[PDB]
């Protein structure tokens, strides 16, 4: 076969009438994963940091 004759990718290629379809989907997904991760990391860090604050049993009102 001739290397200039590119194999068929038609089953995979998005029939491009909308150019930035996959880009907008990918960047939304990547953006949303970034959002929920940062909120998750923030909550995880606060959980640990707050375990070092005064314990419920040592807050005595003398």
């Amino acid at each position: 076969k001739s290397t200039y004759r590119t194999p068929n990718f038609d089953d995979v290629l998005k029939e491009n009438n909308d150019a930035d379809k996959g880009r907008s989907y990918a960047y939304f997904m990547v953006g949303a994963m970034g959002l929920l991760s940062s909120a998750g990391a923030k909550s995880t860090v606060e959980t640990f940091i707050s375990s070092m604050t005064a314990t419920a049993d040592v807050l005595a009102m003398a």
Binding site: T47, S51, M52, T53, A56, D57
Partner: protein
């Protein structure tokens, strides 16, 4: 060159995590190792924050853990993460090991990689036992008693080792204070052994599911397997979260919510689930010395597999008899654990003794015989003279 390459610290990161050439075809079974590193981090971080609130004195240890549960903000989350994480650490380790078994990862040139792995496994088992003792519930006290007594089986100087390990006449304050100190230490030795594990991994690279060379088609770690790792990291966290928040005590033992009592061993005593197969193996031998020898040998026999696997191809993917007997091994191992959870009673004692035999026979007999037969079958099926 790029800074990630030229800098002394970053180049380590680059060669292990970014540009590291991976075989294109490794499947999700190769995600377990990163999950083990993650587990190691979860155990260390949650343990240090708990240590801040923990007292190792035998009078105070159980109450100091109740104090973490009740008074420390998010304390129950730390404790339940640690306890359930230890279990998840073993689930994933068994899968990592089973993966290695199936795909011939223990084979040359990765024998050193495998041997260091077996050391990590022993260290991880010892670390979890030390931690379990620190709670000082009923299972803690008698676990400490039974396991330190393993060494009394040693000829002549055995009871001397035990009293030295105890720091006195029985499992007491000296014992629990030194077991906490040791529980803190060994995770860091495991960390150093993991680095040695990754060093041996790096010089030959990962294997792959076909069992053949990966040299003809590599893709970089970065992007492809970084984000593929992320998929199983989140699935792992999801499931660990379901236990920690919704079912935090399902993988433990109710007797360890009872303070340890030196005068009473509960009838309901059962080892931690991840120790059950090994427990069963020991219990199957009606002799003290030989019971503890056979149990230790059940771990060391993992070292024998590079020599008893006689096959000429790496891994079980294209091997009909080896696949079948591999799953005999796995389900035999589950049975050993179900026997461990049972009473020393009629059908169970014999089943455990036969399952014990099957366990050892796999490495020493089945694999060498079957892999030889498969060698010959592959040959006479294609050669015409």
């Amino acid at each position: 060159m790029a800074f990630r390459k030229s800098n002394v610290y970053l180049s380590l990161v680059n060669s292990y995590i970014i540009d590291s050439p991976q075989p294109s075809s490794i499947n999700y079974w190769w995600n377990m190792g990163s999950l083990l590193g993650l587990c190691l981090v979860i155990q260390i971080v949650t343990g240090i924050f708990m240590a801040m609130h923990y007292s190792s004195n035998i009078e105070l240890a159980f109450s100091s853990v109740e104090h973490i549960m009740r008074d420390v903000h998010n304390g129950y989350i730390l404790r339940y993460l640690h306890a359930n994480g230890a279990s998840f650490f073993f689930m994933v380790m068994f899968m990592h090991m089973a993966k290695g078994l199936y795909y011939g990862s223990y084979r040359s040139p990765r024998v050193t990689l495998w041997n260091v792995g077996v050391i990590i496994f022993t260290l991880t088992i010892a670390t979890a036992f030390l931690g379990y003792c620190c709670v000082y519930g009923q299972m803690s006290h008698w676990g400490a008693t039974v396991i330190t007594n393993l060494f009394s089986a040693i000829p002549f100087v055995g009871n001397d080792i035990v009293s030295w390990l105890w720091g006195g006449f029985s499992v007491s304050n000296p014992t629990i204070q030194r077991f906490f100190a040791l529980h803190y230490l060994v995770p860091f030795i495991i960390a150093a052994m993991v680095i040695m594990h990754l060093m041996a991994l790096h010089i030959h690279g990962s294997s792959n599911p076909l069992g053949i060379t990966g040299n003809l088609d590599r893709i970089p770690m970065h992007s492809y397997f970084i984000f593929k790792d992320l998929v199983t990291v989140f699935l792992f966290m999801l499931i660990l979260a379901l236990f920690v928040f919704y079912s935090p005590n399902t993988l433990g033992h109710p007797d360890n919510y009872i303070p340890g009592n030196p005068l009473v061993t509960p009838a309901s005593i059962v080892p931690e689930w991840y120790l059950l197969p090994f427990y069963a193996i020991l219990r199957s031998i009606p002799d003290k010395l030989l019971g503890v020898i056979t149990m230790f040998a059940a771990i060391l026999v993992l070292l024998v597999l590079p020599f008893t696997d006689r096959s000429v191809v790496r891994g079980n993917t294209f091997k009909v008899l080896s696949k079948f007997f591999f799953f005999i091994f796995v389900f035999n191992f589950v049975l050993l654990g179900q026997i461990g959870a049972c009473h020393v009673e009629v059908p169970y004692v014999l089943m455990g003794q036969i399952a014990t035999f099957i366990y050892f026979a796999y490495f020493l007999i089945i694999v060498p015989v079957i892999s030889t037969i498969e060698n010959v079958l592959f040959y006479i099926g294609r050669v015409n003279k």
